[PDB]
């Protein structure tokens, strides 16, 4: 009788000259209307995301067969295309997290603090429990 499907927000998220950080989504589209340019990626559903720190750019290209192609680019901070820019981006990522924690305040906790320790698997932290809970380092050999 009635009914409606859940809405999908297709469209751009940033304009020309806006600053982005790695992992941020720039475009949500149902078809490949826009193609990935430099310093960007594309998901299996045609989601375009940034892969470095920089500013968003838009450009148009005319192909060999007379079709129009549209790209999305991310430009480095000072137009630095050298391979040394990657380490600068890594430092900026660490700094950005510190800025956010300072603004939010101490009472917005960003790590858990339980009365027990989480198990370790394959050298990383795991959220799955072991069959038995034991204190670390409270037993000797044999």
């Amino acid at each position: 009788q009635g009914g409606k499907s859940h809405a999908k927000n297709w469209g751009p998220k940033f304009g020309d000259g806006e600053i982005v950080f790695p992992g941020m989504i720039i475009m949500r589209q149902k078809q490949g209307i826009y193609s990935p340019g430099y310093n960007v990626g594309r998901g299996r559903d045609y989601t375009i995301f940034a892969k470095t720190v920089g500013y968003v750019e838009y450009s148009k290209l005319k192909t060999e067969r007379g079709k129009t192609r549209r790209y999305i680019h991310v430009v480095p901070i000072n137009d630095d295309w050298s391979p040394e820019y990657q380490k600068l981006a890594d430092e900026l990522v660490v700094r950005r997290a510190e800025v956010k924690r300072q603004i939010l305040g101490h009472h917005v906790h960003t790590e858990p603090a339980f009365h027990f320790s989480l198990p370790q698997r394959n050298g990383n932290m795991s959220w799955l429990l072991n069959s038995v809970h034991k204190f670390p380092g409270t037993t000797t050999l044999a």
């Binding site: 809405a7 806006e18 600053i19 982005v20 950080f21 901070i77 700094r95 950005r96 800025v99 603004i103």
Partner: protein
């Protein structure tokens, strides 16, 4: 966008710009608009001067004892306490509370706008220089209670606030500035004995 939750986009963008500025220094170091910014001024036009006005009221002495008054044949218009009055000797007027005067004191009123008799009239534009009116302070009183009441039907709203205004009473003694018409002169003593206590 459909959600009513407030957006955090401005917070996410500020954290990105702050991080870059903290680590990467800028190339420019000056701004011309700041370099030539001039001193702060009050305005860009000359100030408008004010128009002088005569003094409102001033004490000149005190009254020693009981007196009597007779009727005269002159009148005038005087501005006092924000309103105008038409006065002749032996009149009583009620005004707002006047500060700095006491009962049984004589005051001088200088904002005279009109003087008249039975043979001549003098018109001020807007004030007459060299004219004055004398009066005696008789009372500083609280007037009758005024009951202030407010209510809104069906809204559970009701307010009651009684009040008592403050006022002053004066009796006119003499009007100076215009001569009576011929044959209208008062040829006998008229007013009280005043002890002058204001010499400038």
């Amino acid at each position: 966008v459909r959600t009513k939750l407030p957006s955090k986009r401005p917070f996410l963008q500020t954290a990105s710009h702050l991080a870059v500025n903290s680590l990467v220094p800028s190339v420019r170091t000056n701004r011309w608009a700041d370099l030539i910014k001039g001193p702060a001024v009050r305005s860009c036009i000359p100030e408008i001067p004010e128009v002088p006005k005569p003094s409102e009221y001033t004490t000149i002495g005190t009254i020693e004892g009981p007196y009597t008054l007779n009727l005269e044949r002159v009148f005038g218009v005087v501005e006092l306490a924000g309103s105008q009055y038409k006065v002749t000797p032996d009149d009583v007027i009620f005004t707002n509370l006047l500060h700095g005067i006491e009962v049984n004191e004589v005051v001088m009123l200088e904002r005279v706008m009109l003087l008249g008799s039975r043979s001549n009239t003098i018109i001020g534009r807007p004030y007459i220089p060299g004219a004055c009116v004398l009066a005696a302070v008789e009372e500083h009183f609280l007037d009758g209670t005024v009951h202030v009441f407010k209510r809104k039907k069906r809204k559970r709203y009701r307010r009651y606030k009684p009040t008592r205004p403050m006022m002053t009473t004066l009796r006119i003694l003499k009007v100076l500035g215009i001569d009576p018409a011929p044959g209208d002169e008062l040829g006998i003593p008229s007013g009280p004995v005043i002890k002058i206590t204001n010499t400038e």
